[PDB]
């Protein structure tokens, strides 16, 4: 393969078989476009999601360093903190989570239910902060405290979106390419774009495996101006570590996340209702509902390169449905 | 070979590949015994569970008879209603759910979060009743009213547990035999025993594929005296349908569900905490927490036939964690 360098990296096995790639016949009949879905929401640990693919690489690295503790950061309802805390429990590592409340809510289900409930079941040590103004710096400061309490911490950045963690999405792109050879004319792929490892890993893999496909990131927290340089830097870092070329443009749509990270919106929630009622698929208010709202509007406004099939990357997130209900 | 008549029943494809069968090393270390887990909680539709295995057969049968509406019953937080509603939404079938509040709670997360919240996403028609005093009669009365609107209803009993729904768990037993072949010599299998389709279908399959394995049902709702005839009637009806005999004794432990169906207990809670903290695995207060508290106590009191490996069937249930929090 041109991606054989992927095999050099130590990785734990958290997923196993390739997740399903399915046609959505009802959604496709409704929108008048062929739509497929990559089910990375079915990864098998603690209600699943896209970060288990990153943690395969990140946590192998932690064990190679002989760490006994994983430290990461996110919102109170972060799916990434959730998955990290579940993998720590599975492997008998301590977990420390630096959390913020990004939306100033006092609603009890946001503060205590959904992913935050699961953190307690996993004996995660919780450190609250007023704001994740500089997450890398704050995690480093924290890790140095914890190391001085007798532990050996390993720091996973927000979203696990380092180049190493993003190799999980180069892996997802290999599965996608294998599964789409039985999909005449896949034109576009749509994914939420936040901390950017998913988007950037897909970007590097799909450039090599499926070069005619257009990868669109629907932003969940930032403008195209603020987000593009982030995704490009990661794209280049991953491709460097794989000794691959990466010249593809990064495409981002920023119209779908207002009024901010972590705040549900109407088109988001209508997309969650559409996917649940037509296909029995569960999206989420923060990431995948907004990304799907984007895919749907892309159809409406003819925003894609052509009218051909569209593959949606389901990255997970559905446990937050229970935290966001009935409102925040 | 002896389960061959199983291929005669039409069945839809909901599950796809065999679900994981995993060793639990951290729980095995704590309990002093080899514990493996069959991950039927990762079946890929709408948060998963044991009922997708029965719905493959039941919904195939609905479609063959030209039915366009599924009608079933359970508690407000039933996982079975939730799975049925999701498969209905996926196939463009109407779904009507007769629900009761079995525990008399007014707690808002029980009334409106968890599985209950998912049903509204799947456009389920909800029919409340005061109590499921005669669910088969009550479903028929409902079906008469629904047919009067021009719908073509197919009634699925509580839990899906007819002999035909049970065939899902005869199939499960084939998977488990294959997965354990030349990998582990199982001694015992533990599963929750409620409406009894899972218990009975495993009983038939295991008697024929792994006749020396002891299968233990842990009741979730009834004493041994009240539950055993239900499991035996299914067991015999399933065997009848497959042209087989089933001479095995049904085994049931009833010490772990008090004070009743859907009421959490301390040992259940402690089993949920142990599995999350040691293995990153999520159980549930109604079914699997109680079945795992039974497994634990079975080991503590030497209730099993020997000291050999035990397979726990994880039948799902975790969305209820969000409905039971913070209390009922
Ligand atoms: C469900 C879900 N989907 C998408 C994303 C965005 O993935 P990325 O962080 O790789 O941009 C996340 C981030 N935690 C997520 O949790
Ligand atoms: C999670 C869970 N586990 C176990 C059971 C009991 O299975 P059965 O009805 O086949 O006895 C149920 C019933 N719906 C369930 O939801």
Chain B residues within an 8 Å CB radius of A124 = none
Backbone angles phi, psi at A299, to 5 degrees: -65, -55
Rounded Cα–Cα distance for residues B234 and A308 (Å): 50
Same domain, B165 and B152: no
Residue A232 Cα to ligand 2 middle (Å): 48
Q: What CATH number is associated with residue B278?
A: 3.40.50.1100
Chain B residues within an 8 Å CB radius of A85 = 280
Rounded Cα–Cα distance for residues A179 and A17 (Å): 12
Q: Does A289 touch chain B (CB under 8 A)?
A: no
Return the DSSP state at A221: S
Residue numbers of the domain that contains A251: 1-49+160-328
Find out whether B100 and B108 touch, Cβ atoms under 8 Å: no
User: What total of structural domains would you count in chain B?
Assistant: 2
A172 as an active site residue: the answer is no
Between the alpha carbon of residue A205 and those of residues A72, A245, B311, the distances in Å are 26, 11, 39
Same domain, B242 and B311: yes
Residues 6 or more apart in contact with residue A285 via CB below 8 angstroms: A264, A268, A269, A272, A317, A320, A321, A324
Same domain, B25 and B127: no
Q: Does A17 touch chain B (CB under 8 A)?
A: yes
3-state secondary structure chain B: CCCHHHHHCCCCCCCCCCCCEEECHHHHHHHCCCEEEEEHHHCCCCCCCCHHHHHHHHHHHHHHCCCCEEEEEEECCCHHHHHHHHHHHHHCCEEEEEEECCCCCCCHHHHHCHHHHHHHHCCCEEEECCCCCCHHHHHHHHHHHHHCCCCCEEECCHHHCCHHHHHHHHHHHHHHHHHHCCCCCCCEEEEEECCCHHHHHHHHHHHHHCCCCEEEEEECCCCHHHHHHHHHHHHHHHHHHCCCCCCCCCEEECCCCCCCCCCCCHHHHHHHHHHHHHHCCCCCCCCHHHHHHHHHHHHHHCCCCCCCCEEEEECCCCHHHHHHCCCC
Strand pairing partners for B88? none
Catalytic residue of the set A28, A78, A161, A221: A78
Domain boundary at B124, B158, B192, which?
A: B158
Domain boundary at B158, B174, B196, which?
A: B158
Ligand nearest to the CA of B158: 2
A280–B112 C-beta distance less than 8 A = no
Domain boundary at A158, A192, A215, which?
A: A158
Experimental determination technique: X-ray
Q: Does A16 touch chain B (CB under 8 A)?
A: yes
Same domain, A193 and A142: no
A118–B280 C-beta distance less than 8 A = no
Same domain, B183 and B298: yes
Find out whether B74 and B81 touch, Cβ atoms under 8 Å: yes
Tokens 């008879």 correspond to: B65
Same domain, B56 and B117: yes
- Within 10 angstroms of residue A107's Cβ, the number of other Cβ atoms is 15
Considering only CB atoms, A322 lies closest to which of B280, B322, B326, namely B322
Same domain, B44 and B83: no
Tokens 């009191």 correspond to: B301
Ligand nearest to the CA of B166: 2
Find out whether B120 and B38 touch, Cβ atoms under 8 Å: no
Same domain, B150 and B181: no
**Which of ligand 1's atoms lies nearest the C-alpha of A316?**
1
Residue B202 Cα to ligand 1 middle (Å): 38
Residue A287 Cα to ligand 1 middle (Å): 6
Resolution to 1 decimal place, in Å: 1.7
Same domain, B110 and B251: no
Same domain, A203 and A60: no
Strand pairing partners for B214? B188
Q: Does B260 touch chain A (CB under 8 A)?
A: no
Same domain, B99 and B233: no
Strand pairing partners for A138? none
Same domain, B182 and B306: yes
Rounded Cα–Cα distance for residues A235 and A254 (Å): 19
């Amino acid at each position: 393969m041109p991606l054989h360098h992927l095999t050099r990296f130590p990785r734990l096995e958290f997923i196993g078989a390739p997740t399903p790639l399915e046609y959505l016949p009802r959604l496709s009949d409704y929108l008048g476009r062929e739509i497929y879905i990559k089910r990375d929401d079915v990864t098998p640990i603690a209600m699943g999601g896209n970060k288990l693919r990153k943690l395969e690489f990140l946590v192998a690295d932690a064990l190679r360093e002989g760490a006994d503790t994983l430290i990461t950061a996110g919102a109170i309802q972060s799916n990434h903190v959730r998955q990290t805390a579940a993998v720590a429990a599975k492997l008998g590592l301590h977990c420390v989570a630096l959390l913020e409340n990004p939306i100033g809510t006092t609603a009890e289900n946001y503060l205590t239910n959904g992913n935050r409930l699961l953190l307690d079941l996993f004996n995660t040590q919780i450190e609250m902060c007023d704001a994740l103004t500089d997450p890398d710096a704050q995690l480093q400061t924290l890790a140095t405290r914890i190391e001085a309490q007798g532990f050996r911490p390993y720091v996973i950045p927000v979203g696990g979106s380092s180049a190493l963690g993003a190799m999980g999405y180069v892996e997802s792109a290999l599965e996608i390419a294998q599964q789409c050879e039985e999909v005449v004319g896949l034109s576009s792929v749509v994914v939420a774009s936040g901390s950017a490892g998913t988007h950037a890993g897909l970007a590097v893999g799909l450039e090599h495996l499926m070069p005619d496909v257009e990868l669109i990131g629907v932003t969940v927290s930032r403008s195209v101006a603020e987000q593009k340089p982030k995704v490009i830097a990661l794209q280049q870092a991953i491709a460097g570590q794989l000794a691959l070329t990466a010249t593809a443009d990064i495409h981002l749509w920023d119209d779908y996340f207002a009024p901010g990270y972590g705040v549900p919106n109407d088109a988001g929630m209508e997309a969650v209702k559409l996917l649940a009622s037509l296909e029995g698929v569960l999206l989420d208010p923060v990431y995948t509902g907004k990304a799907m709202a984007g895919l749907i509007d892309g159809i409406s406004q003819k925003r894609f390169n052509d009218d051909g099939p569209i593959l949606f990357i389901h990255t997970g997130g559905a446990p937050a449905l229970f935290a966001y209900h009935p409102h925040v």
